[PDB]
Design a protein around this ligand. Sequence first.
Ligand SMILES: Cn1ncc(C(=O)N2CCC2)c1C(=O)Nc1ccc2sc(N3CCOCC3)nc2c1
Ligand SMILES: [Mg+2]
Ligand SMILES: [Zn+2]
Length: 313
Amino acid sequence: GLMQFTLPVRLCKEIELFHFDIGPFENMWPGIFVYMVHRSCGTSCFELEKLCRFIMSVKKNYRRVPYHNWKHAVTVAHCMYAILQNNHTLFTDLERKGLLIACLCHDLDHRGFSNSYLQKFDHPLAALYSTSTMEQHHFSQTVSILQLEGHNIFSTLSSSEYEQVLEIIRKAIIATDLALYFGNRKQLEEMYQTGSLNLNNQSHRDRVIGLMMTACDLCSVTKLWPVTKLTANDIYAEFWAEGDEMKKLGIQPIPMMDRDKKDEVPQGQLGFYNAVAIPCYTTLTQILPPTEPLLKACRDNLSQWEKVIRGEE
Ligand SMILES: Cn1ncc(C(=O)N2CCC2)c1C(=O)Nc1ccc2sc(N3CCOCC3)nc2c1
Ligand SMILES: [Mg+2]
Ligand SMILES: [Zn+2]
């Protein structure tokens, strides 16, 4: 009850900022996550013993892949923490509980391959889940860990509150399918501009939580340039491995995943910032003005990629 987590001063201060990097010390990541739950939710939200045991089972079920790993899980949870802390009164008690857990679980048991690759490989998961293949797997894995003895961190919720939180977590994990992002943001754009956006409309909240999930999931592009640049290496290491596997199935991969087109990476980052990142943080800032630092950091990084193309780095 009276057992807080406390971080060193530099971390205590920087963790509140959107651009915080959780650092290379893996053994501190669980404590950083519990710290965020305690300040975002309260020290009473979860039984500490059950929470710690849930965190270590989730960690164990992330794989040693270059990007879709345990560090990504905690990084995406920190961005959600930052959004929630800067928008105190906009979110219910169940949403704060659900969304930090959703972010930690959103890529559970990722193998470093896209939905496309599973479908062309004809992976068993592509027969079990025809769309959002990995995302339905990630939610399924989340429910599994929640049902290990001693792992039900939601045990003190009523039957109906329990169903609401698992429903929040399910929609939040499905929304990390970037194929669903484009249409979700277009709808949010129209609703905001025609003034029909209503946060008491549950279907509207769902859309806004979906955009938050895309924003947290892409947060590599909102860090300081040195973090953004070194994370891009991890991202492309997965993409190029998938490219290699596409070639092994007798399929030329898209350029994004072809390691023979390393030269085109800076221009590929431009298209991605313009087509996905900038629009994502723009619409998010319109709906949640205090998330403007994410849009500002994204724009800074776009400018850094333009400088790479111009040979200034
Ligand atoms: C930065 N970032 N963060 C998340 C993601 C992301 O897509 N997701 C899916 C799981 C993570 C990305 C990212 O870089 N995405 C991205 C998208 C289109 C193209 S086209 C291209 N080039 C083609 C031409 O040749 C060079 C590269 N490179 C890219 C890179
Ligand atoms: Mg994912
Ligand atoms: Zn992710």
